[PDB]
Symmetry: D2
Subunit: 476 residues, 4 copies
């Protein structure tokens, strides 16, 4: 089974006013599995009024009470994690084992942010005149509009929602029409835990119509988007025209630097595992493997061996470790990336093809001998493709790593302090993981640089985009 | 004496390749006093290249060395304060005494920021696996494009410049064509102190063309603009379209709430004195005077008396306490504000006319019986005009204070703790001063909310728009 | 019912080696209710070995796991709060309603410290040479010896224990022989929640023999004591002789300043309620009431009215609001304080006598017209006695407030910002509460100044006495 | 030239009421050079009264004014660096070049602390009831009694003095009778800068009698001592008996771990150079050289060569790189250390004798084949003596590094990240420097663990022993 999804407005699950719905298909099959309410402008006016009213309510609830309510939502997300994961796998394609991991960590994230909300500290500044008190108070910015994409239906809502809620903001999210049930199950946990009516809202419909209406509207004080770099540029431009606070989490093109002193088995296990996680459909997925010439061939073979050991299948089989891609455009885009690679003289080491003629299954693919003008080494592939090149000198790996307008994550494998320290200072990324896969715990900052966007969704830094800082000076 | 001003590119004071200049007028007389170079695209290209190199240089200079270099520049600014102030008054209109105060407070800013650059701290997070070290590191964002207005020619530059230098970014500023010499003099103190070629640049010319070229350019990593709300919106739109970090300090419309228990005489002294400072051409200037009805008449008359005491004349003549407005557009703008007040039934209690027929002199003006639809109570007048309205309940004054889309500064006068705490919580402003005029020290955050923009220019918060946060996790 | 109490050593509840026990009496009755193991030196050697081994174990458990374990202990303390409170009332005398409040808030404290342990942050310092990394790491100091008194058997263990546990330290507490069962029930929750063997230890016996042995012993790296000022001086002296880190929470003598603009009903309700809480047996209990002459008489009558409305009785009756004093020396000391008051010419307004001839019931007592040489206005009474004097000028109240070598808490009632600000800057206390009773939440610092001791048991500051800070600089 | 030194009391350089003096010797010659006033109880009484008044004064001076005053003092210290260094070398023994370095680094300290005084921040805690404001405020503790040793006469004073002045405490120091003039000269820079009468005081005399009088005295709120472990224990015992805040910087015994992958030449240059700095009379001097057996012989010979290169002679003669030891007790102490090394079977590889028959000259000495029971490997030698021992496993070196009750500084040389991280975690020291000598900058914490005491003299942490934390909760 798989349920139809409704809008959440003012504490109620409701149909759109007009009754219109959008069909939802299972990517592993191509067959309808349900429908989602298609909101129009009238449903949006009701969500906005409600968000305003919810903000006036929520900002008055003391932080410790807000925290206890959020921890209650978290316990419910944990309990319902298998049922929610089954919804997710069906609508998005990832393996059930991966969906379960995603939802359980959603509960972890909520819990950390609930406690963070109690530690939004102000400051007292030693004054220039002892007869005055000089303070810096932090307070919530107001109603937030969030736009979240399909690759992690739950986890891309959960950080934004948790940070908003921990600060005293209300929250109105447009989630993906193609993966709508698992984000709605997340918000249902919050409604059941006692977050009052209007603090949270959820809508689905025509993405352009919704974002063009919410972002200029005077109820909304803060906008947050995660998605593609070109769509973000369009939304950050609209937000700027209406002077709205904005954060953006966009495309990455993560380099992997395998230094001469690297453990190779480890690199392959850690970066290769990470590459094929959610079929490469991750803003932090390692893409450009820069491997020292001394071990390049050995690395390339071991990666090929890892790709070929993946069990492609419908994500509901527990043994499936590579599911279908999320939707048919991902096939088109993977076909295009692989064509261009062949055309520019790269070698397709394994994979490189659609599997079957039903659903969106594409084969895990490793490209070697990749020239620098290849599409895969310039545009974000966002799919189950690795591209390998060699280097001699660590300084040339770093410059390659920094060549692109992205961005976001980077990985490396090395053992010397000197290399760790050099990669730390020089690599143009928001997050760098060395000798392990990505472990984006909620207490670590998470966000990009350059075209990958700005603002963090972890650590205390994650609260700041939702806060206003106010200087107060009172002469006694 | 008044000097002609050049562009600063890659260590060198130079003319524009085209040789073009713009005439500089003294607002007190209407008479030409000098000229400034009118930069074109070609000179911007050399500034941008120089900025790139300067960033590579300055990012490598240890913070304690950057700090000592910045502190020398500040010592130079102090040494040259009379000369700088003389240039400012001539080009901008303010009295010599206020110019000197601006220039000295510039030095105070540079010093605080010099020291703050040494305290851009990272952090170490207790890890989930004890074999890994989880750190968060702070780094400079990159080359900055800055755009600054004419109201405080030196001070609007210095906070942006100081922030950028303390973090290790390079800095390219477009300063006002109408007030070129005093900022160029500030920049010349930094060159003479030892800031290397390319780290700082200064251009003048057509503002639209400079903005449109610098903001989309891939060398610029971060944009900062101080100015009016409409231009900031156009600039933030563009920044967004090209995914640039942006901060904005825009229009204010500061309410002043004089409560039933206020010390009226202190209220007149503090907020009257602040009103006519720089002839009200200040983003935090008290404008909407909300006075409890019990003391409204007493307050109006005392404010009228304070306006009448002011000595209007040329800024070089000692005695002068209110100079000329900075340009002919401000006179037209004041007559419109006053014509509208009268049209809508308000009473001009004093002032309200041009003085003489040469230069930009406007009498200090107090308006009462102001209806809620008068231009002065909706648009930022940015001029030597106070508007007074009465209230009965503090709650009504608070709701009026929040009514407009602006939210920069707020003022109040009251003695009860409960009202301090209420005002602190409820007022939608970035900065609030109670029982005193504004004292915007560099250690205090300084920035807006709503249509007044975002990002702070004081406190440790002023460094954050100039920094990227990198999560680094290394497994042993 | 009421249970006999054992030692906790190495995960096991055990008798002392020798079999010796100490009888426990109910203060409301004077009758034996049980016994507690009397530890000797051999039991201490076993506790110390175990604490060493527990420290090596606990310091290796990642913080998030430590937190989850502590939150589990907390949920068990919450569930068992009524059963634990019944033990407490019996052995200590406080009303059951007060005992329940104490234990429930113990669970709150644990939960806040569990999350605090995850936020023990290090720092990265911008280096003087870019080739080095300069860091500040925080790590646990080691095995802690804690000595806790009888007035709040559970809450004086719980803060020390929680802070130790959140930092990675092991913990060995000597709890009170006269109130031993409710602290043992607290530690039992931690054992049941999965804190491993030896991380926590609990012993009872001859207070001088235990503290003389634990404090010099090389396993113990940190000592913490809460109790009387003269006993602390002796223990801080021993700790200093063996160079052991020490914190001390000692006697208070809390002033209450009721200013001329005070709400009187509120002052009486808030400070009077607080005075008779746990029969005045609290280091923060308001003792010296300094009331403005204009309302002194009205305050004195309303306090008398509050004291006379207390229902004296055995604490197990739900309606009892003043229980018996904790032990027979409290009667002797209250007899002495009241004698001296009468002798120096003070007036006993109500109470002043033992009630009955069984148990330790003393009457709630209010003394007025108190000269400055009266014992009650110099030595900490630690019992159900208030002492009232007048003042004319707020500055004279403050000097009186600051006259004594204590210390700890202070209270006031006033409405003006000016007074709030003056009391804030001038009053020599660790904690100041204004227009309310004490609400010592775990997120607020808690500790004294002067003879009241040093170190805080709340806020992040509470972790620092358990941490070592290490500067690390590594040249690449 | 060398000058006689006086007491500094309440703004005035004065003699002791008794008129007594102590002779000051030049350690390089044995010859008298001057005298210092020998303070008695009566002069201490005037210092204590003056300290009380000075505290009342300085606590009222806004932090930005305190900072500017401190920065002037620092500018004076720089101006007078040759003169101060001349006094130091004469009285203390170190070469002129090292004295000048000490004096200049003093100025650097004062400046950092000046700036840190402006950033003693309080905080605002999200409240449990929104009608209350919960703040935590920082205040100066009160008058300080400081006791400082002869090894860095100016530098051991300056950190304590700077900390105390930045927080707003007053300061009374007993400096070394054997090296009086250079600290008095430092204190004279603060008097000439404008620090008011009473805020700073300076006495000399009988150390025991001064200590016993100042520590129990009710004017003294905080004690700080730098010195040997046995005297610190006696002083901490007394501080404790009178419930005074105390910090202690005591004996160190720094291990140096040269790992199998070390750069041996850098190891010799960094830790050899640091060994003979101030002829090893430093609390963080490398002493126990633990060298991997593979490179031990290479290391020993290179260190012997570096010791042999040093130029022994009077500190005023240029060329001199190792001066005389500071007093005759240090010669006796070195002969004992060397007599014991030889008795226990170690080999003296170079040095190990007195040079000449006048003054306190000792040859730079390297000892190898050192058994674990030799005095040099258990007691702090505080002299120009390195002891070398080999190891096979890094784990054995780490367990030796931790074996002693001292734990001040530690050094290592290694290239692998895993060893940096291991050493960082496992070494029981306050400060660790890897691949470089010690660089104790004022922004880095500086303090011990175990028998080396407690409290930091660097970083923001250096201010915390000089501050009290006050929780303030005000209900509207």
């Amino acid at each position: 089974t798989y349920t139809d999804t409704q809008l959440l407005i003012d504490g109620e699950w409701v149909d759109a006013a007009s009754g219109k719905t959008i069909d939802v298909v299972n990517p592993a099959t191509g067959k309808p599995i349900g429908r989602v309410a298609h909101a129009g402008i009238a449903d949006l006016d009701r969500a906005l009024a409600a968000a305003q009213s919810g903000f006036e309510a929520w900002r008055k609830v003391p932080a410790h009470e807000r925290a206890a309510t959020m921890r209650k939502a978290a316990a419910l997300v944990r309990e319902r994690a298998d049922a929610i994961a089954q919804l997710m796998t069906q609508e998005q394609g990832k393996p059930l084992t991966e969906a379960r991991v995603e939802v359980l960590s959603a509960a972890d994230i909520i819990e950390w942010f609930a406690d963070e909300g109690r530690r939004v500290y102000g400051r007292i500044v030693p004054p220039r005149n002892l007869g005055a008190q000089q303070t810096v108070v932090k307070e919530p910015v107001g109603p937030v509009a969030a736009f979240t994409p399909w690759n992690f239906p739950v986890n891309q809502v959960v950080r934004k929602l948790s940070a908003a809620l921990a600060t005293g903001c209300s929250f109105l999210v447009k989630a993906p029409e193609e993966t709508p049930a698992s984000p709605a199950a997340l918000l249902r946990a919050f409604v059941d835990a006692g977050v009052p009516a209007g603090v949270i809202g959820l809508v689905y419909g025509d993405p352009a119509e919704i974002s063009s209406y919410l972002i200029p509207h005077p109820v909304i004080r803060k906008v947050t988007f995660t998605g593609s770099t070109p769509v973000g540029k369009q939304l950050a431009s609209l937000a700027g025209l209406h002077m709205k606070r904005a954060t953006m989490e966009l495309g990455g093109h993560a380099p992997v630097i395998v230094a001469e002193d690297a453990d190779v088995a480890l690199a392959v296990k850690a970066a290769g595992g990470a590459k094929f996680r959610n079929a490469g459909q991750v803003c932090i997925s390692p893409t450009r493997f820069l491997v020292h010439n001394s071990i390049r061939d050995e690395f390339t073979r071991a990666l090929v061996k890892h790709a070929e050991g993946l069990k492609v299948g419908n994500g509901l089989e527990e043994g499936t470790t590579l599911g279908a891609l999320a939707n048919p455009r991902r096939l088109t885009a993977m076909a295009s990336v692989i064509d261009n690679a062949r055309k520019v003289g790269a070698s397709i080491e394994t994979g490189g093809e659609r599997i079957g003629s039903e659903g969106n299954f594409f084969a895990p693919t490793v490209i070697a001998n990749v020239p620098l003008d290849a599409d895969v080494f310039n545009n974000e592939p966002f799919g189950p493709v690795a591209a390998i090149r060699g280097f001699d000198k660590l300084e040339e790996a770093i410059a390659e790593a920094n060549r692109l307008p992205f961005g976001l994550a980077g990985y490396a494998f090395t053992r010397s302090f000197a290399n760790v320290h050099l990669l730390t200072q020089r690599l143009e990324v928001g997050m760098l993981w060395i000798n392990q896969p990505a472990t984006p715990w909620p207490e670590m900052p998470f966000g990009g640089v350059k075209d990958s966007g700005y603002g963090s969704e972890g650590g205390p830094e994650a609260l700041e985009p939702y806060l206003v800082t106010k200087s107060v000076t009172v002469m006694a």
